[PDB]
Structures are given as C-alpha cells and as structure tokens.
Amino acid sequence: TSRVNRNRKAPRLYMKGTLAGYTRGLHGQTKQTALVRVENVNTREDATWYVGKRVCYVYHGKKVKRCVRWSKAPARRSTTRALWGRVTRPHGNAGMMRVKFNGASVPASAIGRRIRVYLYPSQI
Amino acid sequence: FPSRKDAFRAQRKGAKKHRPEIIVIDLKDHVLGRAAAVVAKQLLLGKKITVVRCEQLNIAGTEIRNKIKYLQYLRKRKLTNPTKGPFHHRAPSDVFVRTVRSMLPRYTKRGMKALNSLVAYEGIPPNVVRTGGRVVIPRAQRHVCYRSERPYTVLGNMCKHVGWKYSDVVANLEKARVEKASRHHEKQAKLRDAWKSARKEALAKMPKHNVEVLKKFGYA
Amino acid sequence: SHYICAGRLVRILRGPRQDRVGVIVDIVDANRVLVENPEDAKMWRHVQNLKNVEPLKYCVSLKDALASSKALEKYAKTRTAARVEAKKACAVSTDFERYQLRVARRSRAHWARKVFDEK
Amino acid sequence: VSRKSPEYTTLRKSCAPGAIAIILAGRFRGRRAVILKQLPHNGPLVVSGPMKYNGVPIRRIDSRYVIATSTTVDISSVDTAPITAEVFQRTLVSDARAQLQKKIDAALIAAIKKDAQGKEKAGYLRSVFTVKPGDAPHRWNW
RNA sequence: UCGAAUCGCCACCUACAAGACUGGAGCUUGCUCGGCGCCAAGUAUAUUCAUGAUCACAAGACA
RNA sequence: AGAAAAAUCCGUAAGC
RNA sequence: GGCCAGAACCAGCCCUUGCAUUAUCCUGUGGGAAAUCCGGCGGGGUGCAAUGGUGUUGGCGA
RNA sequence: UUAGGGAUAUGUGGCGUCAAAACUUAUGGGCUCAUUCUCGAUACGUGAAAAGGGUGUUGGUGCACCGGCCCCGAAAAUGGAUGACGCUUAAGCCCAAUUAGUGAUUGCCCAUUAUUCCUUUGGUAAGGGCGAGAAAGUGUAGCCCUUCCGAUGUA
Ligand SMILES: [Mg+2]
Ligand SMILES: [Mg+2]
Ligand SMILES: [Mg+2]
Ligand SMILES: [Mg+2]
Ligand code: NA
C-alpha cells in the first residue's frame, strides 16, 4: 500500500559537461581549442581517463534541415542539431580538458551551456 | 506577472508546472569576499543561484573599522549632478549583489546574463522555504577561515548603523518562521521513528545472503 | 577530546600511509611526532606532522606493551575500522558486485515497506 | 600470423569470447550481452543477449562501443556464424536467421544455467546500466 | 502556429545551534566505564523484444 | 519557465 | 558523390633495476630510575647507467 | 627581435574573481591588527626624516643597547583609487618545496622566441636527368626532379 517512483525510462549513457571558454592569455583568445569542465572530474589523473573520447554540444535552429537518417527513420527530422569533437589533453591540475571540434570552432553562443561527453569512442 | 498570451499558450499546450534547477545557499556565517568569488565563478559557469540569510554574513575586523570603510565609500558622489553619481545601497542583499557585480565582467552581455541569474534575500522567504535542502560553501565558512581570538562583524548590524530601516522586521519574521518549522519538526517524530524501526526490522525478513552482502559493504 | 601523549594510538589522514594506525613513540616538537607500528609492514619509524593525525581512545604504556594492551583488537572491533574497511571494499569492486549490492538494498527497502504497511 | 591472413587479430584481451559486455551506443545502449566470437580479418564482435533476457538478438558490434567486464560465463557452443549470415543481397526475420538464433540461445541459456552463480548472472543480464547524478566511471574497475 | 536546447525525486532532506564544540556518567581533570531510485511490486520457477541490419540529438520522456 | 504568494467551507502545517 | 562519418593496418614522429660510494654511520659490552649526552673495548643514501599511405563498413544522393 | 600556417616546449610575468593557470596546493617554518588620504601588497617610478612606544629576539649582568613588524611624528583645495572588488587559520611580509621523512626523473598557465612538420619566395646557391609525362634552359602557366640556407624596416 506504499508506492515509490521508480526511474525505468531510457538511460543516459554520457557525462554532463559545460563549455568554459577558449584557450587564452592576457592578450586574447585562440578559438580553435575549447575548455570543457566535466562533473565529478576534479584531478589531472581523472581527466587523463577521458582523452580520446567524443563530445557533442546539442542545440537547435529555426528550420528543419537534413539529418543523418533523413530517409529511413523520418521520425528523426527536427530543428535539433549537433557539432561533434574529441578530447585531446588535460588543462591544469583540477580536471579540465582541451577539446577540438571537427573542421571548425564551436560558436561562442555556447560558452555557458551543456556539453555531452560520451564513454565509447575509445572504449578502454 | 505572466501575460495573457503566455497564460493562453500554457493552457493550450497543457504541459505541467516547470521549475528549473536552482541552488539555494544559506549564507549564514560565511566570509563575504570568499563567498562572492565562489558564487561569481559558478554564475559564469552557468548556474542559477539563490542566496538567503544575507544579513548574517561576516567580515573580519571590528564593526567600527568596517563602518568607517562604508562611510568612506558613501562620501563619493558626482558633484555636478548627484542624481547621476554612484548609488549607495544599504541593505545586506544589495551589498552582496554589488560585491558579486564587481567580481563579474558587467559591461558585456555574458556578464549581464550571469548577474541576472542571481537572486538574494534577507532571511528565508515563504516561496523558498519549501523547495528542498539548502547548501553551504565549506571553503568559505568562518569557523575554518578566521582565527577564533580575533574580532569580526555581522553585516546586519553595520548596515543598520549606516541605514537600512528593516532590521526589526526581518528579526520578527525570522523568529516566526523558526517557530513554525520547530512545531512542524516536533510533529512527524513518530513517523520518523516508525520508518527507522521498520528499516531495522526488515533485516530479519530479507534473505540471508542479501544481509551478508549488506554487512560486507557496511550498509548493515 | 583525546590528548597527544606517548603511547597514544593515532590514525593517518592523508598521504601514502592514509587510513593506517600507529603509535606515538616520541614528541619531537609542537608540530611533529615520531610514529611506528610493528604490526604493519609500511609503518616503520618515521616523522609525521600533527596536521596529519587523528588521536584515538587507546594509549599503550614496545611490541610487548602493545600486545599486552590489545588495543589493536579493540580498534578492529569499533565502528571506525568497519567504515574504513567498507570504504576499501567499495573502492575495489566490480560491476557484478555493484549489482549485488543494488539488489540487496532494493530487497531491504521492499521488506521495510511491507513491514511499515503491516504495522 | 600473416598480416593479411583471415585469422589475424588485434582485439584486446578483455574481449575474450564468453565475457559480458555493456553496450554503449546504438539501439540497445545500456543493455548487457555476451560476447560470442570475433569475425575474421580483424572484424566486429558478435553479441547475444540472449533474447528473453534483455531483447538483444544476434548482432554485430565494434569493440570500441563496448565495455568488457571481468565477469564471464564458460561457453561451449557450435558457433556456425560466418559473415555471410550477416551479409545480405541488394518483425520480418528469415527462417535461417530465426533458426540459428533459436539454437544459439538454447545453448547459451543451458550454459548459463549450468554455471554456478547462474541465477545471479541471469539477473545481471536482465539489469540495465545508466549514468546517474553523482558517480564517477573514471574511478571504477569493471 | 510549435518542431525544437535542458535529462533525479520525495508528508523520512525541505527545523535549529556550536567547532576551545559532538551520547551519558564518574571524578582522578585527562583518564576510566537524509530516504528512495538504476528494468519480475522483488531475489526466484518466470516472460514480448530482431530487418531500426556496426557510431550518428534518446526514433524516447517529462518516475 | 525563478512570485519577500498559496499549500462544504469557516475557524484550526494540531486535535477539527 | 572520394559528399559526410566510423573502425582497422603499415611507416614515422610526440609521449611512459645494475655498479660505485655507503663509517661524523650501525650494533653489543660517567652522568642524568629509563632515555638524551660524554670517554674505554670488541664485531659490521647519492653520483653514474639499464603527417603520409592501403583497402573496409554505414548515411545522403534514383 | 618580425615570410603564410599547425603541433610541442619555454622567457619575462604569474596561478581568489574580473582573467588562462594551486575547482583558494602542501601530509613547510616564522612574523603582523593597522578609528575618516594611510596596515601591507609587481623593480625602473611616483610616500618621509630626527625623536618616541606595543608584540615577538639578541649581545652583554649582578639593568643598559639593538635589530624585525606595527603605531605616533605625517596639514590642502571637483568625488576616487595596491588597476577594481575584496583579503587577516591572508588573497600581506622574509625564506623554502612540488604532491611530500615513501625511496632517482619535469606542479601548470600564457609569445610573431626555440624544436619540428607543410606551403611560398630569393640565393656568392648545391646535385641529378634530357598510363601521363621531358624545351641544353637568366627572367613565364617557371624544361623536369631532389637538397640546404635566409626572409621585418623610415630617408
Ligand atoms: Mg624593442
Ligand atoms: Mg580561471
Ligand atoms: Mg624587405
Ligand atoms: Mg620608401
Ligand atoms: Na595588480
């Protein structure tokens, strides 16, 4: 006669990060490398585990353009989009990472927003 | 106050009530500058934060020293037209917000968004009381930041002595709130004890190897 | 509170010898002490800072005196040693063991619900 | 031994046949399956749920999208699964595919049942993996 | 219109105070005697999952 | 999407 | 479509104990219970070495 | 100390926020409380003298002196400046480390510099040749291929 809420929906399968900015000094920034902070990763030994993984940055646009499985699975068509990258090396003593996006830079409109870090691309 | 168009859109869509992820920080017995620096960095990293009990922050030194500092700040005004000059806010929540604003990059849209992501109160208001547990910042607490022999000041007393007519109002509201919460927590003691007893008794009825695993991992 | 004195048993907080138990054998100064423990292989005589120790409630008064006092058995019996061993067990664990712990906890929660409803 | 030989392999030692893997990507992300073999010429792995435990059929998966755990089950099955079973010409399942799946699943379930801790391993295969708020996969071992 | 980004929830947290302070005694004054949640409503005897064909925004939701 | 709001009736985070 | 993606392999590049000295030393056998300390006798841890290629699997394109 | 671009590593200067780096490191030692321009706190350079006192120490001996930090000496004209906020179990001052008495090696951040890779251009240039391709050639859409070094600049 006592019930609880049980979470039996689709699983997550990635870690939640946040863009922090780009690499920079006192003179300005270089936009081709980005800094990402991941939750519960707070040491350089921890951030070493994630080198080679793949990161996403999901957002949305204004109109429906083409996606990966446009023809098969027409249930995927949406205004949602994504921009993939990869982790290259740690950035300090406290568990930050340097990521490199494929063929361009991540836009600066993403600076305070959420980044997905997946477990697979280098499994082990 | 929502617009009639916003209300109509909500009614037509039919979605349920929504609340974003907000962290509520109990700022009692925290060091003002260290708390401000930590909160500013988190706001820039993209968090929504609400701070309560801003009138019980701490500063180091004597109240006379800190009051003289504030009066020196208050002495600055644009001589040619004071209605343009610096505006000196007297409430503790405004003092905290100004410290954070000076630690942010305020003349940029990014810094403006960060500053608007923050809400500050005195005491704990009714719309915040029942939203979940409050947090602390362990690297900015007085009992680990100050040596015990040295004097310190409470922000509420200094702000009362430079202005701030609402100290007694806040005191009365806080006393009433604590009384109500104490009554509620004195209730439910039987329910808490009943749940603890049920947890203790279920061990005798669950399977033995499960009990063994629990004992091995320390949840016994 | 527990005092710092000769023969007092302490636990190490951080460092390569953390969560280990030793005996204070000499007070060098207000900040440093010398610690040894014949039972542990890594605890030969060395210098420890007083910011890195936690005094316990046992004070022997070396191997013969320690064995006679039998403070090691009492420390093994108390609840702090249990918590430390449980922390090591949780640290060294596999996916299968995490699954076993999860099902054990779910079983206990279910039976607690049933008992509460019965009462 | 020869680099271009069909029997060549490089796959790491944790993905030995009979191991239990966590699927990290695709339609069956989060599920746990059993590694059956590796297709030749350093090819993909082959996994089975078995079905009726988690719903994963015989499928091809690259070893980079799987966490191979230390829990295994001893398997001695016939393994008549070449790459032709997966290649195809240029709710709907072929008779050959359905029969092969039936035979393999029968053998696998018999082996799991025979193994000690078998009930626990069946529940383990039924369970689902997810990343929760507050846990660090980089600190665990599997 | 509108498809969109966000991915823990709770009448057990959502009361309070102190760190030269922490359960109760003794004198010998330093010695002695959060809870749940993660795939059978619950740890067993069961049961549908493919062809969405080897990654792709989770083709799924607002427990 | 964040209220110095609220949590037969009326009156009691109680007995009501 | 070499248009966009994934994995694999070659080449290259970046990374990732020994022997010397062991002595103001170690160890048994008048002063301040014991220890710290000072004369007699006996036994014994730091300088070197160890981008370029060659196919394969999907998506979009009738 | 400077051709057009990647990657790796540094110099000067730094690692509480602004602002990249110790998510405010250390399992290092001492000292200091400063009430209206004023406790300190990046040289060049932009804050001060005689004299006098508080807290920590040092010669002497049977009280005197003599240094560290802080206070007094220290008074101007628009409201204002360790860059701002702030900091005192420092985010100050003088020393010293690199994950800490556990045992060989480099905590990390940032250049138009260093190393390396790709491309251009010029030589007091150096070699080779004569299925689509080759001209005995200063200078081109350079006859073809390989190799090494330099590249800023007012009159
Ligand atoms: Mg110059
Ligand atoms: Mg920073
Ligand atoms: Mg020139
Ligand atoms: Mg000219
Ligand atoms: Na400065």
CSV table of N, CA, C and O in Angstrom, one decimal, chain C residues 1-102:
chain,number,residue,atom,x,y,z
C,1,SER,N,37.8,15.3,24.5
C,1,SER,CA,38.9,15.3,23.5
C,1,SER,C,40.0,14.3,23.9
C,1,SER,O,40.1,14.0,25.1
C,2,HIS,N,40.7,13.8,22.9
C,2,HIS,CA,41.8,12.9,23.2
C,2,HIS,C,43.1,13.6,23.1
C,2,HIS,O,43.4,14.3,22.1
C,3,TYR,N,44.0,13.4,24.1
C,3,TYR,CA,45.2,14.1,24.2
C,3,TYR,C,46.3,13.4,23.3
C,3,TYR,O,46.2,12.3,23.0
C,4,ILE,N,47.3,14.2,23.0
C,4,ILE,CA,48.5,13.7,22.3
C,4,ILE,C,49.6,13.4,23.4
C,4,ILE,O,50.0,14.3,24.2
C,5,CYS,N,50.0,12.2,23.5
C,5,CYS,CA,50.9,11.7,24.5
C,5,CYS,C,51.7,10.5,24.0
C,5,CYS,O,51.3,9.9,23.0
C,6,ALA,N,52.7,10.1,24.8
C,6,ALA,CA,53.5,9.0,24.4
C,6,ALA,C,52.6,7.7,24.5
C,6,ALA,O,51.9,7.5,25.5
C,7,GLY,N,52.8,6.8,23.5
C,7,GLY,CA,52.0,5.6,23.5
C,7,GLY,C,50.6,5.7,23.0
C,7,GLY,O,49.9,4.7,22.9
C,8,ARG,N,50.2,6.9,22.6
C,8,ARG,CA,48.8,7.1,22.1
C,8,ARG,C,48.7,6.6,20.7
C,8,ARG,O,49.6,6.7,19.9
C,9,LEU,N,47.6,5.9,20.4
C,9,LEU,CA,47.3,5.4,19.1
C,9,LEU,C,46.6,6.5,18.2
C,9,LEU,O,45.7,7.2,18.6
C,10,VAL,N,47.1,6.6,17.0
C,10,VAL,CA,46.6,7.6,16.0
C,10,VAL,C,46.3,6.9,14.7
C,10,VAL,O,46.8,5.9,14.3
C,11,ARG,N,45.5,7.6,13.9
C,11,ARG,CA,45.2,7.2,12.5
C,11,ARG,C,45.7,8.3,11.6
C,11,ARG,O,45.6,9.5,11.9
C,12,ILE,N,46.2,7.9,10.5
C,12,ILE,CA,46.8,8.8,9.5
C,12,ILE,C,45.7,9.3,8.5
C,12,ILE,O,44.9,8.5,8.0
C,13,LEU,N,45.6,10.6,8.3
C,13,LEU,CA,44.6,11.2,7.5
C,13,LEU,C,44.8,11.1,6.0
C,13,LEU,O,44.0,10.6,5.2
C,14,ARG,N,45.9,11.7,5.5
C,14,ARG,CA,46.2,11.8,4.1
C,14,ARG,C,47.6,11.2,3.9
C,14,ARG,O,48.4,11.0,4.8
C,15,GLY,N,47.9,11.1,2.6
C,15,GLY,CA,49.3,10.6,2.2
C,15,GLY,C,49.3,9.2,1.9
C,15,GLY,O,48.3,8.4,1.9
C,16,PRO,N,50.5,8.7,1.5
C,16,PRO,CA,50.6,7.3,1.1
C,16,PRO,C,50.3,6.3,2.2
C,16,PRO,O,50.1,5.1,1.9
C,17,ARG,N,50.3,6.7,3.5
C,17,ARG,CA,50.0,5.8,4.6
C,17,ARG,C,48.7,6.1,5.2
C,17,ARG,O,48.5,6.0,6.4
C,18,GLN,N,47.7,6.7,4.4
C,18,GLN,CA,46.5,7.1,5.0
C,18,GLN,C,45.6,5.9,5.4
C,18,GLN,O,45.7,4.8,4.9
C,19,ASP,N,44.8,6.2,6.4
C,19,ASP,CA,43.9,5.2,7.0
C,19,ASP,C,44.7,4.0,7.5
C,19,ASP,O,44.3,2.8,7.4
C,20,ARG,N,45.8,4.3,8.2
C,20,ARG,CA,46.6,3.3,8.9
C,20,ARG,C,46.8,3.8,10.4
C,20,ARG,O,46.6,5.0,10.7
C,21,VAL,N,47.0,2.8,11.2
C,21,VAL,CA,47.1,3.1,12.7
C,21,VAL,C,48.5,2.9,13.2
C,21,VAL,O,49.2,1.9,12.8
C,22,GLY,N,49.0,3.8,14.0
C,22,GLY,CA,50.3,3.8,14.5
C,22,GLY,C,50.3,4.2,16.0
C,22,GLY,O,49.3,4.6,16.5
C,23,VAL,N,51.5,4.2,16.6
C,23,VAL,CA,51.7,4.6,18.0
C,23,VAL,C,52.7,5.7,18.0
C,23,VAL,O,53.7,5.6,17.3
C,24,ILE,N,52.4,6.7,18.8
C,24,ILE,CA,53.3,7.8,19.0
C,24,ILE,C,54.4,7.4,20.0
C,24,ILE,O,54.1,7.0,21.1
C,25,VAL,N,55.7,7.4,19.6
C,25,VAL,CA,56.8,7.0,20.4
C,25,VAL,C,57.7,8.1,20.8
C,25,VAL,O,58.6,7.8,21.6
C,26,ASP,N,57.5,9.3,20.3
C,26,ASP,CA,58.3,10.4,20.8
C,26,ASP,C,57.7,11.7,20.3
C,26,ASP,O,57.3,11.8,19.1
C,27,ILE,N,57.6,12.7,21.2
C,27,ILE,CA,57.1,14.0,20.8
C,27,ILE,C,58.3,14.9,20.5
C,27,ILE,O,59.0,15.3,21.3
C,28,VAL,N,58.5,15.1,19.2
C,28,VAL,CA,59.7,16.0,18.7
C,28,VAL,C,59.5,17.4,19.2
C,28,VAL,O,60.4,18.0,19.7
C,29,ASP,N,58.3,17.9,18.9
C,29,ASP,CA,58.1,19.4,19.0
C,29,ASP,C,56.6,19.6,18.9
C,29,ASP,O,55.8,18.6,18.8
C,30,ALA,N,56.1,20.9,18.9
C,30,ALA,CA,54.7,21.2,18.9
C,30,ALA,C,54.1,20.8,17.6
C,30,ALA,O,52.8,20.7,17.5
C,31,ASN,N,54.8,20.6,16.5
C,31,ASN,CA,54.2,20.2,15.2
C,31,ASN,C,54.5,18.8,14.7
C,31,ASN,O,53.8,18.4,13.8
C,32,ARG,N,55.5,18.1,15.3
C,32,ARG,CA,55.9,16.9,14.7
C,32,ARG,C,56.0,15.8,15.8
C,32,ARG,O,56.3,16.1,17.0
C,33,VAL,N,55.8,14.6,15.4
C,33,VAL,CA,56.0,13.4,16.3
C,33,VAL,C,56.6,12.3,15.5
C,33,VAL,O,56.6,12.3,14.2
C,34,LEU,N,57.0,11.2,16.2
C,34,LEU,CA,57.6,10.0,15.6
C,34,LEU,C,56.6,8.9,15.8
C,34,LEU,O,56.1,8.7,16.9
C,35,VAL,N,56.3,8.1,14.7
C,35,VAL,CA,55.3,7.1,14.7
C,35,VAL,C,55.9,5.8,14.3
C,35,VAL,O,56.6,5.8,13.3
C,36,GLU,N,55.5,4.7,14.9
C,36,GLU,CA,55.9,3.4,14.5
C,36,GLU,C,54.8,2.4,14.8
C,36,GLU,O,53.9,2.6,15.7
C,37,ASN,N,54.8,1.3,14.1
C,37,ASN,CA,53.8,0.2,14.3
C,37,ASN,C,54.4,-1.1,13.8
C,37,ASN,O,54.5,-1.3,12.6
C,38,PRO,N,54.8,-2.0,14.8
C,38,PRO,CA,55.5,-3.2,14.3
C,38,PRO,C,54.6,-4.1,13.5
C,38,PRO,O,55.1,-4.9,12.7
C,39,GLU,N,53.3,-4.1,13.7
C,39,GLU,CA,52.3,-5.0,13.0
C,39,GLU,C,52.3,-4.7,11.5
C,39,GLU,O,52.3,-5.6,10.7
C,40,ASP,N,52.3,-3.4,11.2
C,40,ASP,CA,52.1,-3.0,9.8
C,40,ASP,C,53.5,-2.9,9.1
C,40,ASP,O,54.5,-2.4,9.7
C,41,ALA,N,53.6,-3.5,7.9
C,41,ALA,CA,54.9,-3.5,7.2
C,41,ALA,C,55.3,-2.2,6.7
C,41,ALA,O,56.5,-1.9,6.7
C,42,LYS,N,54.4,-1.3,6.4
C,42,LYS,CA,54.7,0.0,5.9
C,42,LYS,C,55.0,1.0,7.0
C,42,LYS,O,55.4,2.1,6.7
C,43,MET,N,54.6,0.7,8.2
C,43,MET,CA,54.8,1.6,9.3
C,43,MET,C,56.0,1.4,10.1
C,43,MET,O,56.0,0.9,11.3
C,44,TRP,N,57.2,1.6,9.5
C,44,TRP,CA,58.4,1.7,10.3
C,44,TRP,C,58.5,3.1,10.9
C,44,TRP,O,57.7,4.0,10.6
C,45,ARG,N,59.6,3.4,11.6
C,45,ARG,CA,59.6,4.6,12.4
C,45,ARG,C,59.9,5.8,11.4
C,45,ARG,O,60.8,5.7,10.6
C,46,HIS,N,59.1,6.8,11.5
C,46,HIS,CA,59.2,7.9,10.6
C,46,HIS,C,58.6,9.2,11.3
C,46,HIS,O,58.1,9.1,12.5
C,47,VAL,N,58.7,10.3,10.7
C,47,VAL,CA,58.2,11.6,11.2
C,47,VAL,C,56.8,11.9,10.6
C,47,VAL,O,56.7,11.8,9.4
C,48,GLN,N,55.9,12.3,11.4
C,48,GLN,CA,54.6,12.8,10.9
C,48,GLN,C,54.2,14.1,11.5
C,48,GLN,O,54.6,14.5,12.6
C,49,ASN,N,53.6,15.0,10.6
C,49,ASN,CA,53.1,16.3,11.1
C,49,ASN,C,51.8,16.1,11.9
C,49,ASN,O,51.1,15.1,11.6
C,50,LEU,N,51.6,17.0,12.8
C,50,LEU,CA,50.4,16.8,13.7
C,50,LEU,C,49.1,17.3,13.0
C,50,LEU,O,48.0,17.1,13.5
C,51,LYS,N,49.2,17.9,11.8
C,51,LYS,CA,48.0,18.1,11.0
C,51,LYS,C,47.6,16.9,10.2
C,51,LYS,O,46.5,16.9,9.5
C,52,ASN,N,48.3,15.8,10.3
C,52,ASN,CA,48.0,14.6,9.6
C,52,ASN,C,47.6,13.4,10.4
C,52,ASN,O,47.7,12.2,10.0
C,53,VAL,N,47.3,13.6,11.7
C,53,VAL,CA,47.0,12.5,12.6
C,53,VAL,C,45.6,12.8,13.3
C,53,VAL,O,45.2,13.9,13.3
C,54,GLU,N,45.0,11.7,13.7
C,54,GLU,CA,43.8,11.8,14.5
C,54,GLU,C,43.9,10.9,15.7
C,54,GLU,O,44.0,9.7,15.6
C,55,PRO,N,44.0,11.5,16.9
C,55,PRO,CA,44.2,10.7,18.1
C,55,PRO,C,43.0,9.8,18.4
C,55,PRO,O,41.8,10.1,18.1
C,56,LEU,N,43.2,8.6,18.8
C,56,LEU,CA,42.2,7.6,19.2
C,56,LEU,C,42.1,7.5,20.7
C,56,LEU,O,42.7,8.3,21.4
C,57,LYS,N,41.3,6.6,21.2
C,57,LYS,CA,41.0,6.5,22.6
C,57,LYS,C,41.8,5.4,23.3
C,57,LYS,O,41.4,4.9,24.3
C,58,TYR,N,42.9,5.0,22.7
C,58,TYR,CA,43.8,3.9,23.3
C,58,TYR,C,45.2,4.4,23.4
C,58,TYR,O,45.7,5.1,22.5
C,59,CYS,N,45.8,4.1,24.6
C,59,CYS,CA,47.2,4.6,24.9
C,59,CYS,C,47.9,3.4,25.5
C,59,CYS,O,47.7,3.2,26.7
C,60,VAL,N,48.8,2.8,24.8
C,60,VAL,CA,49.6,1.7,25.4
C,60,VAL,C,50.6,2.4,26.3
C,60,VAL,O,50.8,3.6,26.3
C,61,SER,N,51.3,1.6,27.2
C,61,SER,CA,52.2,2.1,28.1
C,61,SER,C,53.3,1.1,28.5
C,61,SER,O,54.4,1.2,28.0
C,62,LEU,N,58.4,-2.2,23.0
C,62,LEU,CA,57.1,-1.6,22.5
C,62,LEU,C,56.2,-2.7,22.1
C,62,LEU,O,55.0,-2.6,22.4
C,63,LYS,N,56.6,-3.7,21.3
C,63,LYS,CA,55.8,-4.8,20.9
C,63,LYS,C,55.1,-5.5,22.0
C,63,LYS,O,53.9,-5.8,21.9
C,64,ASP,N,55.9,-5.8,23.1
C,64,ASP,CA,55.3,-6.4,24.2
C,64,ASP,C,54.2,-5.6,24.9
C,64,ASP,O,53.1,-6.1,25.2
C,65,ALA,N,54.4,-4.3,25.1
C,65,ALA,CA,53.4,-3.5,25.7
C,65,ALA,C,52.2,-3.4,24.8
C,65,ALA,O,51.0,-3.4,25.3
C,66,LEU,N,52.4,-3.2,23.5
C,66,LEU,CA,51.2,-3.2,22.5
C,66,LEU,C,50.4,-4.5,22.6
C,66,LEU,O,49.2,-4.4,22.7
C,67,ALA,N,51.1,-5.6,22.6
C,67,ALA,CA,50.4,-6.9,22.6
C,67,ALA,C,49.6,-7.1,23.9
C,67,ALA,O,48.5,-7.5,23.9
C,68,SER,N,50.2,-6.7,25.0
C,68,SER,CA,49.6,-6.8,26.3
C,68,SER,C,48.3,-5.9,26.4
C,68,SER,O,47.3,-6.3,26.9
C,69,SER,N,48.5,-4.6,25.9
C,69,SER,CA,47.3,-3.7,25.9
C,69,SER,C,46.2,-4.2,25.0
C,69,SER,O,45.0,-4.0,25.3
C,70,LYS,N,46.5,-4.9,23.9
C,70,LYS,CA,45.5,-5.4,23.0
C,70,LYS,C,44.6,-4.3,22.4
C,70,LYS,O,43.4,-4.5,22.2
C,71,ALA,N,45.2,-3.1,22.2
C,71,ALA,CA,44.4,-2.0,21.6
C,71,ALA,C,44.0,-2.3,20.1
C,71,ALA,O,43.1,-1.7,19.6
C,72,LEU,N,44.8,-3.1,19.4
C,72,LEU,CA,44.5,-3.4,18.0
C,72,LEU,C,43.2,-4.1,17.9
C,72,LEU,O,42.4,-3.9,17.0
C,73,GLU,N,42.9,-5.1,18.8
C,73,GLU,CA,41.7,-5.8,18.7
C,73,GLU,C,40.5,-4.9,19.0
C,73,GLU,O,39.5,-5.0,18.3
C,74,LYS,N,40.6,-4.0,20.0
C,74,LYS,CA,39.5,-3.0,20.3
C,74,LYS,C,39.3,-2.1,19.1
C,74,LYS,O,38.2,-1.8,18.7
C,75,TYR,N,40.4,-1.7,18.4
C,75,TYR,CA,40.2,-0.8,17.3
C,75,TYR,C,39.6,-1.6,16.1
C,75,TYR,O,38.7,-1.0,15.4
C,76,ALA,N,39.9,-2.9,15.9
C,76,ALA,CA,39.3,-3.7,14.9
C,76,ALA,C,37.8,-3.8,15.2
C,76,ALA,O,37.0,-3.9,14.3
C,77,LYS,N,37.4,-3.9,16.5
C,77,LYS,CA,36.0,-4.1,16.9
C,77,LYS,C,35.2,-2.8,16.7
C,77,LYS,O,34.0,-2.9,16.4
C,78,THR,N,35.8,-1.6,16.9
C,78,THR,CA,34.9,-0.4,16.9
C,78,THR,C,34.4,-0.2,15.5
C,78,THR,O,34.7,-0.9,14.5
C,79,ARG,N,33.6,0.9,15.4
C,79,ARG,CA,32.9,1.2,14.2
C,79,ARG,C,33.7,1.9,13.1
C,79,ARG,O,33.3,1.9,11.9
C,80,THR,N,34.7,2.7,13.5
C,80,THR,CA,35.5,3.4,12.6
C,80,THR,C,36.3,2.4,11.7
C,80,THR,O,36.4,2.6,10.5
C,81,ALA,N,36.9,1.4,12.3
C,81,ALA,CA,37.6,0.4,11.5
C,81,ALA,C,36.7,-0.3,10.5
C,81,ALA,O,37.1,-0.6,9.3
C,82,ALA,N,35.4,-0.5,10.9
C,82,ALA,CA,34.4,-1.1,9.9
C,82,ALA,C,34.2,-0.2,8.8
C,82,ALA,O,34.1,-0.6,7.6
C,83,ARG,N,34.1,1.1,9.1
C,83,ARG,CA,33.8,2.1,8.0
C,83,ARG,C,35.0,2.2,7.0
C,83,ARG,O,34.8,2.3,5.8
C,84,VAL,N,36.2,2.1,7.6
C,84,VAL,CA,37.4,2.1,6.7
C,84,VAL,C,37.5,0.9,5.8
C,84,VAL,O,37.8,1.0,4.6
C,85,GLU,N,37.2,-0.3,6.4
C,85,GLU,CA,37.3,-1.5,5.6
C,85,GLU,C,36.2,-1.5,4.5
C,85,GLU,O,36.4,-1.9,3.4
C,86,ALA,N,35.0,-0.9,4.9
C,86,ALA,CA,33.9,-0.8,3.9
C,86,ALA,C,34.3,0.2,2.8
C,86,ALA,O,33.9,0.0,1.6
C,87,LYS,N,35.0,1.2,3.1
C,87,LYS,CA,35.5,2.2,2.1
C,87,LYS,C,36.4,1.5,1.1
C,87,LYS,O,36.4,1.7,-0.1
C,88,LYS,N,37.4,0.7,1.7
C,88,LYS,CA,38.3,-0.1,0.8
C,88,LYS,C,37.5,-1.0,-0.1
C,88,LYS,O,37.9,-1.2,-1.3
C,89,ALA,N,36.5,-1.7,0.5
C,89,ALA,CA,35.7,-2.7,-0.3
C,89,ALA,C,35.0,-2.0,-1.4
C,89,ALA,O,35.0,-2.5,-2.6
C,90,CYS,N,34.4,-0.8,-1.2
C,90,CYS,CA,33.7,-0.1,-2.2
C,90,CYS,C,34.7,0.4,-3.3
C,90,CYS,O,34.3,0.5,-4.4
C,91,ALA,N,35.9,0.8,-2.8
C,91,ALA,CA,36.9,1.3,-3.8
C,91,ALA,C,37.3,0.2,-4.7
C,91,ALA,O,37.4,0.4,-6.0
C,92,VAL,N,37.5,-1.1,-4.2
C,92,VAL,CA,37.9,-2.2,-5.1
C,92,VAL,C,36.7,-3.1,-5.3
C,92,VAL,O,36.4,-4.0,-4.5
C,93,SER,N,36.0,-2.8,-6.4
C,93,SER,CA,34.8,-3.5,-6.7
C,93,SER,C,34.5,-3.6,-8.1
C,93,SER,O,35.0,-2.7,-8.9
C,94,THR,N,33.7,-4.6,-8.6
C,94,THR,CA,33.4,-4.8,-10.0
C,94,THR,C,31.9,-4.5,-10.2
C,94,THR,O,31.1,-4.3,-9.3
C,95,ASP,N,31.6,-4.5,-11.5
C,95,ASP,CA,30.2,-4.3,-11.9
C,95,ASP,C,29.2,-5.3,-11.3
C,95,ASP,O,28.1,-5.0,-10.9
C,96,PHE,N,29.7,-6.6,-11.2
C,96,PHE,CA,28.8,-7.6,-10.7
C,96,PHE,C,28.6,-7.3,-9.2
C,96,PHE,O,27.5,-7.5,-8.7
C,97,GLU,N,29.6,-6.9,-8.5
C,97,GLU,CA,29.4,-6.7,-7.0
C,97,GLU,C,28.6,-5.4,-6.8
C,97,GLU,O,27.8,-5.4,-5.8
C,98,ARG,N,28.7,-4.4,-7.6
C,98,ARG,CA,27.8,-3.3,-7.5
C,98,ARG,C,26.3,-3.7,-7.8
C,98,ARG,O,25.4,-3.2,-7.1
C,99,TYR,N,26.1,-4.6,-8.7
C,99,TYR,CA,24.8,-5.1,-9.0
C,99,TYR,C,24.3,-5.9,-7.8
C,99,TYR,O,23.1,-5.7,-7.4
C,100,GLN,N,25.1,-6.7,-7.1
C,100,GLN,CA,24.7,-7.4,-6.0
C,100,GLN,C,24.3,-6.5,-4.8
C,100,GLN,O,23.3,-6.7,-4.1
C,101,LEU,N,25.1,-5.5,-4.6
C,101,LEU,CA,24.7,-4.5,-3.6
C,101,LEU,C,23.4,-3.8,-3.9
C,101,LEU,O,22.6,-3.6,-3.0
C,102,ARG,N,23.2,-3.5,-5.1
C,102,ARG,CA,22.0,-2.8,-5.5
C,102,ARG,C,20.8,-3.7,-5.2
C,102,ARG,O,19.8,-3.2,-4.7
